[PDB]
Amino acid sequence: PNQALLRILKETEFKKIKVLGSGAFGTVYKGLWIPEGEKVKIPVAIKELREATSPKANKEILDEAYVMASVDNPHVCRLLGICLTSTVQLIMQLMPFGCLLDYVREHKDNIGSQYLLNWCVQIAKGMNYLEDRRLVHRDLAARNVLVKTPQHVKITDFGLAKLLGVPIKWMALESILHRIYTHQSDVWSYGVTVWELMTFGSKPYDGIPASEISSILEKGERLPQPPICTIDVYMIMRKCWMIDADSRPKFRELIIEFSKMARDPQRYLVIQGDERMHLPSPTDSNFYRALMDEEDMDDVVDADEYLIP
Amino acid sequence: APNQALLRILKETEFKKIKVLGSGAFGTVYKGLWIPEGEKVKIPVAIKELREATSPKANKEILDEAYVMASVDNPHVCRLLGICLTSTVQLIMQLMPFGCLLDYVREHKDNIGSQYLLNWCVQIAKGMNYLEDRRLVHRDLAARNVLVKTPQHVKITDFGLAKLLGAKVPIKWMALESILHRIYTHQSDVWSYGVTVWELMTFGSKPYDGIPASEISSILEKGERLPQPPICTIDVYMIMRKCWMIDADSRPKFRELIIEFSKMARDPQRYLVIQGDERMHLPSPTDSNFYRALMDEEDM
Ligand SMILES: Nc1ncnc2c1ncn2[C@@H]1O[C@H](COP(=O)(O)OP(=O)(O)NP(=O)(O)O)[C@@H](O)[C@H]1O
Ligand SMILES: O=C1c2cc(F)ccc2Nc2ccccc2N1Cc1ccccc1
Ligand SMILES: O=C1c2cc(F)ccc2Nc2ccccc2N1Cc1ccccc1
Ligand SMILES: Nc1ncnc2c1ncn2[C@@H]1O[C@H](COP(=O)(O)O)[C@@H](O)[C@H]1O
Ligand SMILES: [Mg+2]
Ligand SMILES: [Mg+2]
Ligand SMILES: [Mg+2]
């Protein structure tokens, strides 16, 4: 590992301020980092694991943590630091905009086709990067995509489930039945995630008990077409849910298809009031970026630095 | 022709000043919040409210300059982000919580090592060189006019402001030709750079302390210069003294300065002699990756 990537924190260095929420494995807090010998308090997100862990368990966590800290893509969150208290605490960048699911729900009457397609493209790019890095997520869902700015979303919480090993309604059939997790299983989760966005944050299979999901999937039942979706979008979602995992789309393919659609969004999504929705603008984008989202957003191949000696 | 997309024109409704951070010759600086339309998140910003109200005709001039200020693109130069054409004009830029370098060095007077000091010198030279490349003269380079993004990363600020608005006069930082003839050039900026380095090397001491400002050009004309700081090896002092040569063209160029300081930054304890330097905190990759990820994601 490159160890310098993951900061090992003293307990004295940071403080938990307010619970943001809880998930399967821990509780996430808004918090502050207090650099030693400095006056400044820097906002951070802190996760505290639910169960206390032994040193040997901690070693496993730490070793995985180095890999999580090694990610470098604009569409993927990086794990920044760890504090090895009895109950392990982890540190990452704080996203004031919160998770994408909460955002789409909160903005459900004010989100247009351009943003939705753009997010689909971005999530694919992030997932593609994880695939290239041989990292399986296992918990991709709308709750697990963070909004850096409304124009910029990032994948989060990859690797956590394997480490501390159930989001049944996001899981590929082979995963539920046999505990097989692959990139192709992540693709299934991606389809569900897109369905969540397209429905402005509806719950999938709402009212159907999780224990019963594998049964319906086996009979060929799937999530229905969201009203805003043309068949072109819905067909991709259906492909994500094919039984033959190798038959599902690749993230690399998804990036291209969603990118094509994003060039003519109203052709592909039919949304009430779309004609009057806010669209991402350069002056606006440049402003957000200059203030609090400075990272290079270009694909590696399109970056100024790609070929620059 | 500046890309106007680089400067955001703000409505007074978009943002608000929340707290005073400091002040300068031309305005007062606040911590502010920008609230994006249709959002509930508040985004911290820095806002400078100009001291004097301006006309609509003057505002065109300010605005014209602002486009230029917005067009800078260098890791060591601050970029103007936005403007609001209120009766007293307000300008917006990124909040830098660490404040200015001069205050920082004064506050950390007893725990700053040679590596940081030399690195700051290099970075300031880099921003100045960039300003030169852009054909921009600062006119007010000083340690107070360098902001700290993180302790490892500093950025030049307030370039062009004095030319735009000026009718306070930093005599103790000014090249002789500037004092005598109001001539400002990249080369006069170089003189100011030398003073700025002296400020850092003294941990924020005041240049020419005990000498009134009206008397400075006299002493300069007679060959007096700022003394060697006790931490500086003669090698460092020679570069500073070069910055203050009467003949502006004899003075080093920023691009030269980048090279000399970078050399020194390679073996810092050779060039600066600091008590307990061996025990001072050093910039480390770990501290740097964490700081960058939290608060300094710009390409370097
Ligand atoms: N870096 C972050 N910044 C701001 N909010 C965050 C951040 N990370 C997580 N959250 C929020 O914190 C809460 C908890 O996250 P989390 O523990 O991952 O549970 P979850 O996403 O709801 N379910 P799951 O990830 O499947 O276990 C959620 O409200 C998240 O939206
Ligand atoms: O919780 C983890 C985590 C913990 C772990 F031991 C292994 C993998 C993980 N995935 C992950 C991957 C990339 C970024 C962040 C995370 N986060 C979320 C988070 C961390 C810290 C604070 C709040 C939320
Ligand atoms: O105040 C200016 C400024 C105003 C102006 F009308 C002309 C040139 C300027 N220089 C400058 C150049 C590059 C970046 C920032 C600035 N800043 C500092 C600042 C601006 C806005 C808020 C706080 C501080
Ligand atoms: N972008 C900024 N972020 C935080 N503080 C700033 C910023 N700009 C200026 N300041 C502070 O305000 C003081 C005066 O600014 P100025 O008027 O430009 O001289 C500086 O010394 C800093 O303390
Ligand atoms: Mg969790
Ligand atoms: Mg989560
Ligand atoms: Mg001022």
XYZ file of C-alpha atoms and ligand atoms in Angstrom:
714
model
C 0.000 0.000 0.000
C 0.971 3.614 -0.164
C 0.540 4.333 3.514
C 0.854 8.079 3.175
C -2.580 7.902 1.531
C -4.309 6.968 4.808
C -3.909 9.245 7.802
C -3.802 7.590 11.222
C -5.509 9.956 13.597
C -5.227 10.616 17.270
C -8.477 10.806 19.157
C -7.488 14.306 20.262
C -7.318 15.444 16.588
C -11.036 15.328 15.802
C -14.508 15.551 17.255
C -17.943 14.159 16.367
C -20.552 17.011 16.276
C -23.919 15.688 14.920
C -25.251 12.319 13.743
C -26.076 12.417 10.081
C -27.340 8.887 9.914
C -26.787 5.199 10.376
C -26.326 2.318 7.967
C -25.700 -1.376 8.168
C -22.319 -1.106 9.914
C -22.047 2.185 11.718
C -23.081 5.718 12.362
C -21.915 8.675 10.321
C -21.295 12.047 11.951
C -20.618 15.540 10.820
C -17.395 16.415 12.614
C -14.286 18.564 12.870
C -10.591 17.979 12.315
C -8.337 20.109 14.441
C -4.821 20.064 13.083
C -2.267 19.989 15.868
C -0.873 23.456 16.625
C -3.405 25.268 14.475
C -6.482 27.479 15.165
C -8.570 26.066 12.247
C -11.425 23.524 12.492
C -11.958 21.596 9.261
C -15.252 19.842 8.516
C -15.102 16.100 8.071
C -17.402 13.073 7.946
C -16.706 10.482 10.609
C -18.014 6.949 10.704
C -18.010 5.079 13.988
C -18.459 1.314 13.610
C -21.369 -0.183 15.504
C -19.499 -3.124 17.027
C -16.248 -2.897 18.929
C -13.416 -4.771 17.237
C -10.334 -6.717 18.358
C -6.832 -5.720 17.288
C -6.731 -8.599 14.822
C -10.015 -7.451 13.319
C -8.573 -3.925 13.271
C -5.586 -5.134 11.273
C -7.941 -6.528 8.665
C -9.806 -3.237 8.579
C -6.596 -1.227 8.383
C -5.214 -3.300 5.562
C -8.406 -2.867 3.534
C -8.455 0.798 4.508
C -5.175 1.400 2.676
C -6.744 0.160 -0.539
C -9.837 2.317 -0.048
C -7.542 5.309 0.436
C -5.802 4.512 -2.823
C -8.674 5.402 -5.171
C -8.167 8.346 -7.461
C -11.147 9.177 -9.692
C -13.456 12.229 -9.754
C -16.495 9.981 -9.409
C -15.344 7.929 -6.509
C -14.884 8.980 -2.873
C -11.534 8.310 -1.252
C -11.163 7.041 2.303
C -8.984 9.611 4.047
C -8.183 8.438 7.568
C -8.711 6.073 10.454
C -8.681 6.126 14.233
C -8.204 2.743 15.857
C -10.287 3.189 18.962
C -12.009 0.031 20.483
C -14.857 1.131 18.246
C -13.096 2.042 14.921
C -13.669 5.517 13.482
C -13.104 6.409 9.837
C -12.702 9.777 8.186
C -13.714 11.067 4.775
C -14.702 14.286 3.063
C -17.957 15.818 4.316
C -20.619 16.302 1.634
C -23.034 19.020 2.768
C -25.390 18.118 -0.123
C -25.690 14.605 1.353
C -26.604 11.408 -0.513
C -28.125 11.362 -3.990
C -31.284 9.538 -2.843
C -32.122 12.213 -0.283
C -31.261 14.894 -2.814
C -33.543 13.594 -5.576
C -36.351 13.066 -3.088
C -35.907 16.619 -1.709
C -35.694 18.069 -5.220
C -38.211 15.801 -6.905
C -40.224 18.610 -8.509
C -37.143 20.535 -9.631
C -34.872 17.997 -11.360
C -34.643 17.804 -15.139
C -33.515 15.289 -17.743
C -30.015 16.731 -18.073
C -29.079 16.257 -14.450
C -30.519 12.736 -14.267
C -28.684 11.492 -17.333
C -25.490 13.261 -16.223
C -25.644 11.440 -12.888
C -26.124 8.126 -14.658
C -23.045 8.834 -16.740
C -21.045 9.806 -13.661
C -22.006 6.807 -11.619
C -20.969 4.593 -14.545
C -17.604 6.315 -14.754
C -17.007 5.751 -11.048
C -18.126 2.136 -11.223
C -15.950 1.629 -14.305
C -12.953 2.939 -12.355
C -13.611 0.555 -9.491
C -13.871 -2.254 -12.042
C -10.506 -1.293 -13.561
C -9.093 -1.367 -9.989
C -10.660 -4.794 -9.375
C -12.749 -3.472 -6.539
C -16.287 -4.864 -6.196
C -18.665 -2.569 -4.426
C -21.370 -4.917 -3.156
C -23.522 -2.057 -1.856
C -24.150 0.285 -4.771
C -27.401 2.165 -4.356
C -28.643 5.772 -4.549
C -27.989 6.141 -0.827
C -24.425 5.183 -1.649
C -23.799 7.948 -4.129
C -22.855 11.297 -2.602
C -23.576 14.711 -4.013
C -20.423 16.856 -4.033
C -22.303 19.491 -5.934
C -25.542 19.057 -7.877
C -23.435 18.748 -11.012
C -21.024 16.238 -9.513
C -21.794 12.951 -7.788
C -19.393 10.393 -6.325
C -19.644 6.681 -5.393
C -19.165 5.772 -1.708
C -19.082 2.835 0.748
C -17.427 0.297 -1.561
C -15.643 -2.620 0.102
C -17.296 -2.164 3.453
C -19.666 -5.071 3.167
C -17.022 -7.672 2.318
C -14.816 -6.411 5.072
C -17.344 -6.549 7.860
C -19.337 -9.420 6.434
C -28.016 -7.273 3.388
C -29.276 -4.881 0.728
C -31.317 -7.608 -0.868
C -33.351 -5.340 -3.107
C -30.158 -4.068 -4.799
C -28.481 -7.423 -5.160
C -28.006 -9.572 -8.220
C -29.806 -12.881 -8.133
C -26.520 -14.831 -7.982
C -25.547 -12.726 -4.999
C -28.701 -13.476 -3.025
C -28.687 -17.191 -3.873
C -24.966 -17.974 -3.777
C -23.047 -15.034 -2.341
C -21.356 -14.475 -5.678
C -20.198 -10.864 -5.931
C -18.645 -9.553 -9.113
C -18.526 -6.430 -11.204
C -21.374 -7.918 -13.164
C -23.359 -8.156 -9.903
C -22.527 -4.459 -9.331
C -24.041 -3.787 -12.754
C -27.323 -5.209 -11.405
C -27.150 -2.819 -8.493
C -26.459 -0.026 -10.972
C -29.725 -0.778 -12.728
C -31.634 -0.569 -9.469
C -29.822 2.672 -8.656
C -30.858 4.206 -11.986
C -34.390 3.086 -11.325
C -34.258 4.909 -8.006
C -33.107 8.141 -9.653
C -35.645 7.855 -12.471
C -38.438 7.487 -9.961
C -37.187 10.381 -7.908
C -36.317 8.117 -4.999
C -39.062 5.559 -4.801
C -38.384 2.436 -2.807
C -37.850 -0.623 -5.027
C -40.294 -3.448 -4.571
C -41.979 -1.347 -1.917
C -44.069 -3.558 0.372
C -42.480 -6.778 -0.711
C -40.526 -8.457 2.066
C -36.822 -8.896 1.315
C -36.935 -12.591 2.085
C -39.356 -12.988 -0.820
C -37.410 -11.120 -3.494
C -35.337 -14.007 -4.831
C -38.521 -15.893 -5.560
C -40.022 -13.229 -7.807
C -36.758 -12.593 -9.625
C -36.593 -16.309 -10.456
C -40.027 -16.072 -12.123
C -38.762 -13.124 -14.181
C -40.462 -10.297 -12.293
C -38.505 -7.029 -12.395
C -38.948 -3.414 -11.429
C -41.455 -1.699 -13.763
C -40.751 1.072 -16.176
C -40.591 4.449 -14.453
C -43.050 6.861 -16.031
C -40.386 9.331 -17.173
C -38.381 6.667 -19.015
C -38.515 6.033 -22.707
C -37.964 2.424 -23.725
C -34.352 3.259 -24.574
C -33.512 3.898 -20.902
C -35.732 1.144 -19.571
C -34.146 -1.465 -21.881
C -30.765 -0.736 -20.399
C -32.181 -1.236 -16.922
C -33.675 -4.564 -17.981
C -30.338 -5.640 -19.409
C -28.755 -4.883 -16.031
C -31.074 -7.456 -14.532
C -30.471 -10.388 -16.890
C -29.881 -13.772 -15.281
C -26.717 -14.403 -17.278
C -24.317 -12.031 -15.590
C -21.950 -11.937 -18.564
C -24.917 -10.841 -20.668
C -25.471 -7.641 -18.684
C -23.944 -4.350 -19.944
C -20.402 -3.346 -18.895
C -19.862 -0.128 -17.038
C -17.592 0.967 -19.872
C -20.492 0.469 -22.334
C -22.938 2.212 -20.019
C -20.742 5.252 -19.938
C -20.963 5.556 -23.717
C -24.706 4.911 -23.993
C -25.730 7.324 -21.213
C -23.302 9.896 -22.639
C -25.033 9.695 -25.997
C -28.408 10.123 -24.312
C -27.138 13.021 -22.217
C -26.475 14.892 -25.512
C -30.245 14.954 -26.172
C -31.856 14.369 -22.799
C -35.505 15.286 -23.592
C -35.432 12.592 -26.301
C -34.816 9.988 -23.597
C -36.614 11.158 -20.442
C -40.099 12.665 -20.374
C -40.429 14.809 -17.293
C -43.181 17.155 -16.225
C -41.955 20.720 -16.485
C -38.625 19.685 -18.068
C -38.724 22.680 -20.364
C -38.400 25.000 -17.350
C -35.987 22.983 -15.110
C -32.605 24.428 -14.205
C -29.792 23.294 -16.397
C -26.140 23.122 -15.385
C -24.340 26.232 -16.513
C -20.652 27.033 -16.941
C -20.570 30.199 -14.973
C -22.438 28.438 -12.213
C -20.289 25.340 -12.511
C -17.081 27.305 -12.485
C -18.242 29.050 -9.332
C -19.107 25.906 -7.396
C -15.834 24.347 -8.487
C -13.668 27.298 -7.564
C -15.210 27.491 -4.119
C -15.420 23.877 -3.012
C -14.946 21.375 -5.833
C -11.520 22.016 -7.338
C -10.560 18.497 -8.445
C -10.011 17.854 -12.159
C -13.220 16.567 -13.644
C -11.952 15.561 -17.061
C -11.772 11.916 -18.144
C -8.135 10.869 -18.091
C -7.920 10.896 -21.873
C -9.432 14.368 -22.149
C -7.296 15.960 -19.456
C -4.796 18.655 -20.330
C -2.086 16.533 -18.686
C -2.751 13.296 -20.507
C 0.081 13.618 -23.015
C 2.002 16.492 -21.405
C 5.602 15.548 -20.672
C -10.495 38.884 -24.356
C -11.253 37.383 -20.959
C -13.792 34.629 -20.835
C -16.567 36.350 -18.922
C -17.843 32.998 -17.746
C -14.966 33.132 -15.274
C -16.577 35.884 -13.236
C -19.878 35.324 -11.568
C -22.138 38.315 -11.286
C -23.988 37.987 -8.006
C -27.283 39.258 -6.792
C -27.341 40.630 -3.257
C -29.916 37.987 -2.481
C -27.456 35.184 -3.310
C -25.062 35.735 -0.470
C -24.497 37.223 2.872
C -21.682 38.546 4.963
C -21.535 36.811 8.280
C -18.294 37.707 10.057
C -15.378 40.116 9.865
C -12.031 38.529 8.971
C -9.846 41.529 8.480
C -9.270 44.685 6.554
C -6.925 46.422 4.174
C -6.322 49.760 2.483
C -9.280 49.476 0.109
C -11.837 47.322 1.915
C -13.092 45.047 4.642
C -13.057 41.310 4.280
C -15.769 39.032 5.579
C -16.509 35.397 5.871
C -19.648 34.964 3.820
C -22.128 32.324 2.706
C -23.294 31.793 -0.833
C -26.690 30.186 -1.110
C -27.252 28.643 -4.491
C -30.664 29.048 -5.967
C -33.045 26.234 -5.118
C -30.707 24.773 -2.469
C -30.600 24.735 1.323
C -26.861 24.272 1.615
C -24.800 27.356 2.526
C -21.346 27.631 0.988
C -18.558 29.560 2.770
C -16.974 32.353 0.759
C -14.740 35.376 1.331
C -16.207 38.758 0.534
C -14.485 42.111 0.296
C -16.681 45.114 0.599
C -14.955 48.146 -0.830
C -14.406 51.087 1.475
C -15.720 53.765 -0.834
C -18.914 53.763 -2.844
C -18.477 53.938 -6.574
C -20.309 55.306 -9.551
C -21.820 53.395 -12.424
C -19.022 54.688 -14.685
C -16.296 53.614 -12.263
C -18.062 50.289 -11.845
C -17.534 49.526 -15.514
C -13.821 49.984 -14.854
C -13.779 47.776 -11.802
C -15.798 45.187 -13.632
C -13.434 45.289 -16.556
C -10.483 44.630 -14.266
C -12.418 41.904 -12.457
C -12.643 39.826 -15.614
C -8.885 39.908 -15.776
C -8.591 38.980 -12.079
C -10.953 36.087 -12.718
C -8.817 34.789 -15.574
C -5.751 33.806 -13.567
C -5.030 30.072 -13.472
C -2.063 29.093 -11.318
C -1.818 27.119 -8.080
C 0.084 29.937 -6.442
C -2.145 32.806 -7.429
C -5.560 33.647 -5.963
C -8.384 33.997 -8.488
C -11.270 36.457 -8.268
C -14.538 34.560 -8.447
C -17.506 36.928 -8.313
C -18.757 40.465 -7.977
C -21.849 42.248 -6.752
C -22.415 45.793 -8.027
C -23.863 47.199 -4.889
C -23.442 50.848 -4.050
C -20.391 49.808 -2.154
C -19.063 47.070 -4.445
C -18.559 43.561 -3.150
C -16.059 41.036 -4.502
C -16.055 37.295 -3.845
C -13.243 34.720 -3.664
C -12.490 31.396 -2.033
C -12.350 31.424 1.765
C -8.954 30.708 3.138
C -9.346 29.978 6.805
C -5.573 30.098 7.611
C -5.464 33.806 6.782
C -2.453 35.736 5.576
C 1.116 34.460 5.673
C 2.448 37.327 7.778
C 0.011 36.649 10.611
C 0.677 32.953 10.293
C 4.422 33.322 10.589
C 4.021 35.695 13.567
C 1.664 33.232 15.323
C 4.005 30.297 14.613
C 7.169 32.241 15.205
C 8.722 29.557 17.429
C 7.729 26.408 15.435
C 8.528 27.046 11.865
C 11.334 25.056 10.212
C 13.644 25.772 7.294
C 11.758 23.504 4.914
C 8.510 25.481 5.206
C 10.235 28.840 4.918
C 12.154 27.974 1.758
C 9.071 26.260 0.257
C 7.086 29.474 0.814
C 9.781 31.424 -0.964
C 9.624 29.105 -3.888
C 5.844 29.198 -4.114
C 5.678 32.985 -3.940
C 8.232 33.223 -6.747
C 6.158 30.798 -8.782
C 3.006 32.906 -8.481
C 4.910 36.093 -9.282
C 6.465 34.489 -12.346
C 2.967 33.552 -13.441
C 1.785 37.109 -12.952
C 4.749 38.199 -15.074
C 3.802 35.681 -17.762
C 0.344 37.221 -17.745
C 1.888 40.699 -17.998
C 0.384 41.660 -14.643
C 2.227 43.896 -12.114
C 1.254 43.389 -8.502
C 2.328 46.672 -6.971
C 1.720 45.519 -3.427
C 3.625 42.265 -2.864
C 4.143 41.706 0.816
C 3.810 38.880 3.318
C 0.373 40.281 4.240
C -0.602 39.858 0.578
C 0.101 36.180 0.525
C -2.661 33.909 1.760
C -2.245 30.481 3.320
C -4.385 27.792 1.748
C -2.781 25.155 3.927
C 0.545 25.431 5.778
C 2.121 23.677 2.791
C 0.492 25.869 0.144
C 0.467 29.640 -0.202
C -1.066 31.864 -2.861
C -0.540 35.488 -3.936
C -3.446 37.924 -3.440
C -4.415 41.551 -3.996
C -2.488 41.999 -7.244
C -3.771 44.899 -9.317
C -5.902 46.411 -6.613
C -3.750 49.448 -5.922
C -3.542 50.327 -9.609
C -7.293 49.981 -9.959
C -8.403 51.940 -6.897
C -5.398 53.741 -5.523
C -5.156 57.451 -5.157
C -2.346 53.448 1.406
C 1.316 53.477 0.378
C 3.645 50.602 1.272
C 6.835 52.680 1.061
C 8.927 50.180 3.002
C 8.163 47.520 0.400
C 8.588 49.708 -2.698
C 11.434 49.764 -5.186
C 13.291 53.053 -5.239
C 12.034 53.899 -8.743
C 8.513 53.408 -7.515
C 9.012 55.825 -4.637
C 10.791 58.468 -6.736
C 8.924 58.130 -10.034
C 5.792 56.035 -9.543
C 7.279 53.490 -11.929
C 5.901 50.002 -11.361
C 7.258 46.988 -13.197
C 7.904 43.278 -12.819
C 11.297 44.388 -11.675
C 9.870 46.645 -8.935
C 7.754 43.660 -7.832
C 11.069 41.815 -7.533
C 12.245 44.369 -4.988
C 9.074 43.839 -3.009
C 9.648 40.082 -3.251
C 12.981 40.619 -1.534
C 11.321 42.453 1.287
C 8.670 39.774 1.519
C 11.378 37.135 1.914
C 12.989 39.266 4.613
C 9.705 39.328 6.470
C 9.477 35.532 6.406
C 13.118 35.027 7.411
C 12.614 37.328 10.418
C 9.416 35.525 11.369
C 7.405 38.689 10.603
C 9.542 41.574 11.817
C 8.875 45.061 10.493
C 11.217 46.327 7.783
C 13.207 49.454 8.668
C 11.744 49.609 12.167
C 12.574 52.952 13.775
C 12.826 54.738 10.462
C 9.959 56.955 9.323
C 8.490 56.279 5.918
C 9.283 59.711 4.489
C 12.967 59.049 5.143
C 13.242 55.717 3.339
C 14.208 56.890 -0.134
C 17.075 58.833 1.380
C 18.603 55.840 3.035
C 18.028 53.759 -0.068
C 19.827 56.352 -2.182
C 22.791 56.182 0.212
C 22.994 52.425 -0.109
C 21.384 51.297 3.116
C 19.409 48.043 2.974
C 17.620 45.644 5.272
C 19.980 43.698 7.526
C 20.809 40.005 7.287
C 18.344 37.976 9.366
C 20.183 35.792 11.911
C 18.772 32.601 10.418
C 20.014 33.399 6.934
C 23.219 32.085 5.573
C 25.018 34.597 3.416
C 23.738 32.708 0.356
C 20.171 33.693 1.144
C 21.147 37.241 2.027
C 22.978 37.701 -1.311
C 19.793 36.886 -3.223
C 17.803 39.319 -1.097
C 20.380 42.071 -1.617
C 20.229 41.416 -5.385
C 16.515 42.177 -5.285
C 17.329 45.620 -4.045
C 19.770 46.783 -6.603
C 19.185 50.319 -7.831
C 19.340 49.128 -11.399
C 16.088 47.260 -11.861
C 17.418 45.201 -14.736
C 20.322 43.982 -12.609
C 17.806 42.455 -10.217
C 17.033 38.728 -10.494
C 13.998 37.579 -12.459
C 11.234 35.598 -10.789
C 12.036 32.668 -13.006
C 15.637 32.820 -11.759
C 14.361 33.100 -8.196
C 12.288 29.958 -8.572
C 15.400 28.034 -9.481
C 17.648 29.385 -6.720
C 15.070 28.874 -3.972
C 14.136 25.453 -5.254
C 17.836 24.478 -5.014
C 17.944 25.674 -1.460
C 14.647 23.914 -0.634
C 16.497 20.661 -1.523
C 18.999 20.858 1.369
C 17.156 23.623 3.634
C 19.313 23.197 6.729
C 22.308 24.117 4.619
C 20.828 27.508 3.800
C 18.915 28.456 6.954
C 20.163 28.058 10.490
C 17.380 27.608 12.946
C 17.616 26.592 16.603
C 16.048 23.173 16.951
C 15.288 22.962 13.238
C 16.088 19.275 13.523
C 12.965 18.934 15.783
C 10.589 21.210 13.792
C 7.619 19.729 12.009
C 8.315 18.990 8.391
C 5.851 18.855 5.588
C 5.054 15.184 5.085
C 3.231 13.343 2.336
C 0.669 11.993 4.831
C -0.257 15.403 6.333
C -0.317 16.783 2.715
C -2.635 14.157 1.192
C -5.061 14.619 4.091
C -5.026 18.424 3.871
C -5.421 18.293 0.094
C -8.330 15.886 0.178
C -10.165 17.936 2.786
C -9.441 21.470 1.737
C -7.014 21.793 -1.216
C -7.980 19.626 -4.166
C -6.541 21.911 -6.879
C -3.947 20.495 -9.257
C -0.496 21.450 -8.205
N -19.219 11.803 3.449
C -20.565 12.076 3.845
N -21.019 13.331 3.928
C -22.295 13.609 4.308
N -23.153 12.641 4.616
C -22.752 11.333 4.557
C -21.465 11.024 4.167
N -21.351 9.663 4.199
C -22.497 9.136 4.575
N -23.343 10.146 4.778
C -24.741 10.087 5.240
O -24.684 9.497 6.510
C -25.733 8.597 6.664
C -25.223 7.218 6.871
O -24.476 6.551 5.836
P -24.356 5.059 5.841
O -23.771 4.529 7.184
O -23.381 4.691 4.763
O -25.711 4.365 5.706
P -26.657 4.191 4.448
O -26.076 4.777 3.177
O -27.956 4.899 4.740
N -26.996 2.570 4.248
P -25.713 1.613 3.720
O -24.531 2.460 3.143
O -26.195 0.648 2.707
O -25.189 0.822 4.959
C -26.550 8.757 5.430
O -27.496 9.749 5.657
C -25.627 9.220 4.475
O -26.334 9.982 3.547
O -17.276 3.375 5.753
C -16.528 3.449 4.806
C -15.560 2.287 4.580
C -14.929 1.715 5.736
C -14.053 0.646 5.565
F -13.464 0.129 6.634
C -13.788 0.126 4.282
C -14.405 0.681 3.152
C -15.321 1.756 3.332
N -15.883 2.332 2.152
C -15.584 3.695 1.819
C -14.843 3.840 0.606
C -14.449 5.101 0.204
C -14.752 6.222 0.986
C -15.461 6.091 2.186
C -15.886 4.784 2.627
N -16.649 4.573 3.890
C -17.731 5.515 4.240
C -17.353 6.548 5.250
C -16.060 6.613 5.740
C -15.720 7.588 6.674
C -16.687 8.482 7.123
C -17.989 8.430 6.641
C -18.323 7.453 5.704
O -9.564 42.456 -3.366
C -9.141 41.850 -4.316
C -9.062 42.597 -5.643
C -10.113 43.521 -5.922
C -10.067 44.249 -7.101
F -11.049 45.103 -7.347
C -9.011 44.091 -8.015
C -7.974 43.194 -7.746
C -8.012 42.466 -6.525
N -6.977 41.514 -6.312
C -7.297 40.123 -6.171
C -6.763 39.314 -7.223
C -7.036 37.957 -7.222
C -7.849 37.398 -6.234
C -8.398 38.190 -5.217
C -8.114 39.601 -5.184
N -8.674 40.492 -4.126
C -8.764 40.028 -2.716
C -10.152 39.620 -2.324
C -11.186 39.562 -3.257
C -12.466 39.178 -2.863
C -12.715 38.829 -1.539
C -11.682 38.871 -0.610
C -10.410 39.265 -1.002
N -9.837 34.827 0.754
C -9.623 35.091 2.134
N -9.927 34.174 3.061
C -9.735 34.408 4.393
N -9.232 35.549 4.830
C -8.905 36.530 3.937
C -9.092 36.327 2.576
N -8.675 37.461 1.937
C -8.252 38.339 2.836
N -8.392 37.768 4.047
C -8.102 38.291 5.396
O -8.451 39.650 5.401
C -7.305 40.379 5.670
C -7.303 41.582 4.811
O -7.452 41.376 3.389
P -7.058 42.469 2.428
O -8.104 43.615 2.475
O -7.070 41.884 1.029
O -5.706 43.023 2.785
C -6.196 39.423 5.366
O -5.060 39.729 6.091
C -6.706 38.192 5.813
O -6.640 38.102 7.222
Mg -22.645 1.693 7.416
Mg -24.183 4.433 2.942
Mg -7.984 45.944 0.762
